[PDB]
């Protein structure tokens, strides 16, 4: 989402979260 | 007698002495001697190389004993005796140790290295003794010496004579490759040497010793003839390269110094003379090219290097080329080059002295080191502290040592600035380190927090702003280094602590991101409240609200990323189920 | 972060297998088809359970920490835990 | 047939020398 | 279907961290497979193939960080068989501003010419580094203003900063600990050139670093290691990087520049010192290089040993600096040294006089490197600022060079020799070169020249024994 | 001939184990004691039967050549062939 408020473990967790959301849609 | 009696004498006088001055004087000598005395009680145990080093050690120690002035000077008649008994204790030791070998045909490097330890002890110790007494201690006007060493001078030269000649004997039997003629000559060499175990000096046998060495050289003269044929062939095989040909003549030199072989090789020596004469024409063209083509200190270094090259060429020629007639023309023409080089070196050193001494009043080169020169400056345009200064100070220390190493005396004005420049250079290198720390810590904040740190950065930079208003003393500069280190530590401590509270709030935000919200909502809200009060404990550490706004804006975005996701899956949980 | 690290491994010299597995024996990440991903996940889960059992029969006071498995066609590599494990596969070296 | 044990040990020592040197060397479990 | 256990297993930050760690382990195993397998042949020529040999490989300058930086260092490990380490200037212009403020080190394999295996970046000008005395863990470095600094080649790949340069991804490893943090003023007040791994005979780990000033003041350090550290960083010991493993602790002070001086003065009279090397047979024996043409001798915990100074063959002083030392790695107590005069010496530790000395070879110019080949025990490589390289071989001849190469039109800035297999292990005397034009360029020697015949190490003891 | 190779393998850096076992399931001598040798030879033989199946179960046209187990105490190495398999144990490094 936002480039000013970056933080790797949080942002990258949100990438895992989005992969769970997409896995749920696939499943 | 033996050196231990001197040390015992200073032990007695230091304890007993009928006035405090005598006790202290004797103790002062007793301590200097005590270093060498411990080694002299041990002398028979020592290995030869430690005895070689002991010559240098005692050279210094006894030169201090003689020269020190804070008490009545050391007794001269006893000094002569002391030097003689040291020579006696060395002689006894050298005789005992060198006597111990199977002094025929042992594996030569051992025999050579033991022989060289003895020879060099004697050569040095004779050289050193007349240097210390006759040069140094005559020239010491606080207490001039009265003489030139009798045991050392005579017996040291005897030891040189025998040990060199025995070194030559062993090296000669080494030069011989295997054939039946070696067996015949080697047995013939041993036989006249028998009974004449030579390390024990005896002047009643010295004539018989000389006579025996004449028999040895007679047997060897047919051997020298045979050796020279193979040696001259090898020296002709390498003949195209002057570099390699010279290096062959350097290593063979004690074999070549045998006067018979010197005459056998004579055309190879005459062609070496021609080669090295032409090399000196090349060196003269090279030196002319250095006049055609700091730059002056590099010139001084190169012409000193060329004096040492021609001096070597002349010293190599002094044994090797002399006894040729042609060598006289080489010797004078090489001496001319050496003298022209000495002249040009002095010209360049005096001209360098003009460059530096005219620089003592003019800041354009950088030598007038002063408080208006910016050691420290801040790039707020970079986020960095920077530290740089006149390269001329590094060039000053480099050139002032280098000339002193070649052989010059530095003018006292140049010495006194170079003292200060040494201290200044040391501390400028520490200020680089501390600034290179303050540059590195900038990377180690995370972006959103950085306004909280603004106060710590400005405090560290306030130490620049008050100080600019310190070369003035190395003490003050050491304190300035310590002040910047203290402030850099204060910042680094504050940053590292705050970065852990930030990482802690990351942990709580991922712990909340982990949770399907609907069935956990009250526990999720409690964890968000715990996070908000956690942030408030950071505010409790001191900070004013404005910095906390920048940080809490970033945090509100982080928790929004988590909440927004858990909402999106909470909506699909109506579609999918 | 983690996806880029799996992409980093996917790109290496002679490498292609990446499978992340749960202690129910079922996979969670892949650069491979789900049927083959599950063949490797189920087989490695059986094999980890016998490996940990074997280490505890060898020495009950010890425990398992890594497994590596080299075959004429490829080498398989396994990083176990109580809840989770990683499988990777590479050409020989 | 001890020569088969010796031939096995020639093949296996060539690998095992390489692999034990690697496992001696490696950072992989620091 | 997707199961209810998938959500806690994929989501958990501990299980995310388990993929960070497990893939960090996987990455280094795949690198180490490339270190086991790979060949020299990946490039055959891009460059002038030089007089020594037939074949060449470049360390490609098209990597944009290297595209405008000149080179000057090369360092090698004896015990890590195949790591080459290179060092790079600032660009005057034209790349990423973050890197432009910084100096670059690159750590390479002779069999990985595609790029650096790791890239390290630094807050100072560098000119010393050495790789670990065992198990290749760390790179140690010394700098133009006395920082002693350490890189850990293991640390994830993402605690350190990174950039995607053009299409491709690179990371620029900030150093894991620096001396600069230390609060009490005990670090080097000087420029450095020695950074020596003192091999061992104070917990978790132990081996030693010895680093040396131009000034003649020595420090010795131990390497000591946290079990794990908070990602926010150490809060007690500030000199460490965020999350770092390794720190250096200080345990010596030797005033070498005062102590063995040929003294006439206090402030420039003290000897400038140019090196340390520690004897591989026994790390308690070290020798030191000087601007006075002496090589000085020393021991660590005992007070006195002899001979005290290795001398020139000529009497008095022969004042031209010594500019490199090396001990034959085969472990005889013998070493090569050579002056900025062009003069060379070869010594045995048990004699103050050279067992050989030479002068006449490199046209009296500055020699700027002397090294003993780790492949042939007798064979030594010398290099001059006239861009000449020469091999000498003490079993063949000691008159001068056995072979000579003059490079042109490129000048030579740096040259280094490659590491130590056994000959049946495929020993490999490769030279790494750098041009004033700034490319790094590897030339491999013919295996007949590089690999020894029978008993050459003993045959060299027999030379020193017959002489 | 053979026992000299056993001393060569015993000599290795940080190592203290050797066991050879035959394809019929019988151990050869060790630098370890007979109780330990029985326990290791039998347990690892069962584990290698599962291992060689597992690689063949991934591909029947493949076969297995080396194995590693790392554990909290130490690392263990395994190397099988037609008539014999080897166990080696290496202390932490």
Folded structure, characterized:
Chain A: Belongs to the dynein light intermediate chain family. Chain A: This is Cytoplasmic dynein 2 light intermediate chain 1. Chain A: It is found in: Golgi apparatus; Cytoplasm; Cell projection, Cilium; Cytoplasm, Cytoskeleton, Cilium basal body. Chain D: It is found in: Cytoplasm; Cytoplasm, Cytoskeleton, Cilium basal body; Cytoplasm, Cytoskeleton, Cilium axoneme; Cytoplasm, Cytoskeleton, Microtubule organizing center, Centrosome. The complex is a heterohexamer, with one copy of chain A (27 residues), one copy of chain B (577 residues), two copies of chain C (93 residues), one copy of chain D (30 residues) and one copy of chain E (467 residues). Chain A has one helix at 8-26. With 27 residues, chain A is mostly helical. The longest helix of chain A is centred in the middle third of the chain and has 19 residues, at 8-26. Chain C has 93 residues and is α+β, with helices and mostly antiparallel strands. In chain C, 37% of the residues lie in helices and 35% in strands. In chain C, strand 4 (75-80) and strand 5 form a beta hairpin. Classes of the chains: A mainly alpha (27), B mainly alpha (577), C alpha+beta (93), D mainly alpha (30), E mainly beta (467).
| Subunit organisation of the chains | heterohexamer
Strands of chain E, total number: 30
* Main beta-sheet strand count, sense and barrel state of chain E: 4 strands, antiparallel
What is the overall number of helices of chain D?
A: 1
Helix content of chain D: over 70%
Largest two-chain interface: B-E, 76 and 68 residues
Structural class of chain D: mainly alpha
Output the strand order for the largest sheet of chain E.
Answer: 1-30-29-28
Largest sheet of chain D: none
The helix tally of chain E amounts to 6
In whole angstroms, the N-to-C terminal distance of chain D is 43 Å
SSE ordering of chain D: H
Radius of gyration of chain D: 13 Å
Task: Assign an overall shape of chain D.
Answer: rod-shaped
Anisotropy-based shape of chain E: globular
Taken as a percent bin, the fraction of beta residues of chain D is under 5%
Strand content of chain E: 25-35%
Helix-strand makeup class of chain E: mainly beta
**Radius of gyration over C-alpha positions of chain E, nearest whole angstrom:** 23 Å
């Amino acid at each position: 989402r936002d480039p000013q408020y970056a933080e790797n473990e949080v942002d990258e967790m949100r990438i895992q979260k989005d992969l769970e959301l997409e896995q749920y849609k696939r499943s | 007698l033996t050196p231990s009696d001197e040390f015992q004498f200073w032990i007695e006088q230091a304890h007993r002495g009928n006035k405090q001055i005598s006790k202290e004087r004797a103790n002062y000598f007793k301590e200097l001697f005590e270093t060498i005395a411990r080694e002299f009680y041990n002398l028979d145990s020592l290995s030869l190389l430690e005895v070689v080093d002991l010559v240098e050690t005692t050279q210094d120690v006894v030169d201090d004993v003689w020269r020190q002035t804070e008490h009545d000077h050391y007794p001269e008649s006893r000094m002569l005796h002391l030097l003689d008994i040291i020579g006696g204790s060395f002689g006894r030791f050298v005789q005992k140790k060198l006597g111990t070998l199977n002094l025929w045909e042992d594996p030569y490097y051992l025999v050579k290295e033991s022989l060289k330890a003895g020879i060099s002890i004697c050569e040095q110790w004779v050289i050193v003794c007349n240097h210390l007494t006759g040069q140094v201690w005559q020239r010491y006007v606080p207490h001039p010496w009265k003489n030139e060493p009798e045991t050392l001078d005579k017996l040291g030269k005897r030891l040189e004579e025998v040990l060199a000649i025995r070194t030559i004997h062993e090296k000669f039997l080494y030069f011989l490759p295997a054939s039946e003629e070696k067996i015949i000559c080697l047995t013939r060499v041993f036989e006249p040497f028998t009974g004449l175990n030579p390390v024990q000096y005896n002047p009643y046998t010295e004539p018989l010793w000389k006579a025996a060495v004449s028999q040895y050289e007679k047997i060897i003269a047919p051997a020298e003839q045979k050796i020279a044929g193979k040696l001259k062939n090898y020296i002709s095989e390498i003949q195209d390269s002057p570099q390699q040909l010279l290096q062959a003549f350097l290593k063979y030199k004690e074999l070549v110094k045998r006067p018979t072989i010197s005459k056998e090789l004579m055309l190879e020596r005459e062609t070496l003379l021609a080669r090295l004469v032409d090399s000196i024409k090349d060196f003269r063209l090279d030196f002319e090219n250095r006049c055609r083509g700091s730059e002056v200190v590099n010139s001084i270094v190169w012409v000193r290097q060329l004096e040492l090259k021609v001096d070597d060429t002349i010293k190599i020629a002094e044994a090797l080329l002399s006894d040729l007639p042609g060598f006289r023309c080489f010797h004078q023409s090489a001496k001319d080059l050496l003298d022209q080089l000495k002249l040009y070196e002095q010209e360049q050193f005096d001209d360098w002295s003009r460059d530096i001494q005219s620089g003592l009043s003019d800041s354009r080169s950088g030598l007038c080191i002063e408080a208006s020169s910016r050691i420290m400056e801040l790039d707020s345009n970079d986020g960095l502290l920077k530290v740089h200064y006149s390269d001329r100070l590094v060039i000053l220390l480099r050139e002032v040592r280098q000339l002193s190493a070649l052989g010059f005396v530095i003018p006292a004005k140049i010495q006194q600035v170079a003292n200060i420049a040494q201290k200044f250079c040391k501390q400028a290198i520490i200020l680089k380190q501390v600034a290179h720390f303050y540059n590195s810590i900038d990377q180690q904040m995370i972006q959103s927090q950085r306004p909280m740190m603004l106060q710590s950065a400005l405090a560290f930079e306030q130490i620049i702003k008050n100080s600019k208003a310190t070369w003035d003393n190395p003490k003050e500069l050491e304190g300035y280094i310590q002040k910047l280190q203290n402030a850099a530590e204060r910042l680094a401590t504050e940053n590292r602590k705050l970065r852990k509270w930030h990482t802690t709030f990351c942990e709580k935000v991922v712990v909340l991101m982990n949770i399907d919200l609907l069935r956990q909502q009250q526990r999720w809200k409690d964890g968000l409240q715990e996070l908000r009060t956690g942030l408030a404990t950071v505010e409790a550490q001191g900070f004013q609200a404005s910095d906390m706004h920048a940080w809490k804006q970033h945090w509100n975005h982080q928790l929004y990323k988590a909440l927004e996701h858990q909402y999106q899956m909470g909506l699909e949980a109506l579609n999918e189920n | 972060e983690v996806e880029e690290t799996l992409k980093r491994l996917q790109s290496q010299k002679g490498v292609q297998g990446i499978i992340v597995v749960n202690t129910e024996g079922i996979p969670i990440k892949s650069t491979m088809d789900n049927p083959t991903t599950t063949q490797y996940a189920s087989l490695m889960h059986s094999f980890i359970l016998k490996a940990r059992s074997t280490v505890r029969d060898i020495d009950p006071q010890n425990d398992l920490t890594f497994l590596r498995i080299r075959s004429k066609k490829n080498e398989i590599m396994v990083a176990p835990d109580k809840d989770y494990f990683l499988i990777v596969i590479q050409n020989p070296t | 047939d001890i020569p088969r044990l010796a031939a096995f040990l020639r093949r296996v020592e060539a690998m095992v020398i390489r692999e034990l040197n690697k496992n001696w060397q490696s950072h992989a479990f620091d | 279907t997707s199961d209810a256990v998938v959500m806690p297993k994929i989501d958990t930050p501990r299980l995310c961290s388990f993929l960070r760690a497990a893939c960090q382990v996987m990455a280094v195993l795949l690198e180490e497979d490339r270190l086991a397998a790979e060949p020299s042949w990946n490039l055959r020529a891009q460059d002038r193939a030089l007089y020594f040999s037939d074949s060449s490989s470049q360390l490609n300058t098209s990597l944009p960080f290297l595209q405008n930086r000149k080179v000057s260092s090369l360092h090698t490990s004896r015990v890590q068989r195949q790591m080459v380490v290179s060092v790079h200037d600032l660009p005057e212009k034209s790349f990423v501003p973050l890197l432009d403020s910084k100096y670059v080190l690159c750590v390479w394999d002779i069999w990985q010419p595609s790029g650096p295996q790791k890239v390290l970046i630094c807050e100072s000008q560098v000119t010393c580094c050495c790789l670990s005395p065992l198990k290749a863990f760390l790179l140690f470095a010394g700098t133009a203003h006395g920082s002693v600094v350490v890189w850990d080649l293991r640390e994830d790949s993402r605690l350190h900063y990174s950039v995607t340069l053009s299409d491709g991804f690179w990371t620029f490893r900030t150093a894991t600990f620096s001396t600069d943090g230390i609060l009490t003023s005990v670090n080097h007040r000087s420029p450095l050139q020695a950074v020596e791994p003192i091999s061992t005979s104070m917990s978790g780990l132990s081996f030693h670093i010895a680093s040396l000033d131009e000034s003649g003041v020595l420090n010795v350090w131990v390497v000591v290691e946290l079990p794990k550290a908070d990602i926010a960083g150490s809060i007690s010991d500030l000199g460490l990087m965020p999350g770092g493993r390794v720190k250096l602790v200080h345990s010596a002070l030797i005033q070498l520049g005062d102590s063995l001086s040929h003294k006439g003065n206090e402030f420039w009279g003290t000897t400038q010192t140019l090196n340390v090397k520690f004897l591989p047979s026994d790390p308690n024996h070290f020798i030191i290089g000087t601007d006075m043409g002496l090589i000085s001798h020393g021991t660590r915990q005992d007070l006195r040993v002899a001979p005290k100074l290795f001398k020139p063959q000529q009497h008095g002083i022969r004042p031209v600096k010594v500019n490199v030392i090396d001990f034959s790695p085969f472990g005889e107590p013998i070493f090569l040294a050579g002056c900025s005069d062009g003069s060379i010496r070869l010594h045995q530790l048990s004699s103050a006089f050279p067992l050989l000395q030479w002068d006449s070879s490199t046209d009296s110019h500055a020699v700027t490197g002397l090294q003993w080949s780790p492949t042939r025990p007798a064979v030594f490589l010398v290099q001059d600022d006239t861009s000449n390289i020469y091999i000498w071989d003490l079993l063949q001849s000691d008159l001068g060079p056995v072979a000579k190469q003059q490079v042109s039109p490129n000048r030579l800035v740096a040259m280094a020799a490659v590491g130590e297999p056994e000959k049946a292990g495929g020993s490999f005397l490769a030279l790494v070169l750098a041009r004033a034009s700034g490319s790094i360029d590897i030339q491999h020697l013919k295996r007949r020249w590089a690999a020894p015949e029978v008993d050459e190490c003993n045959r060299l003891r027999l030379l020193l024994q017959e002489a």
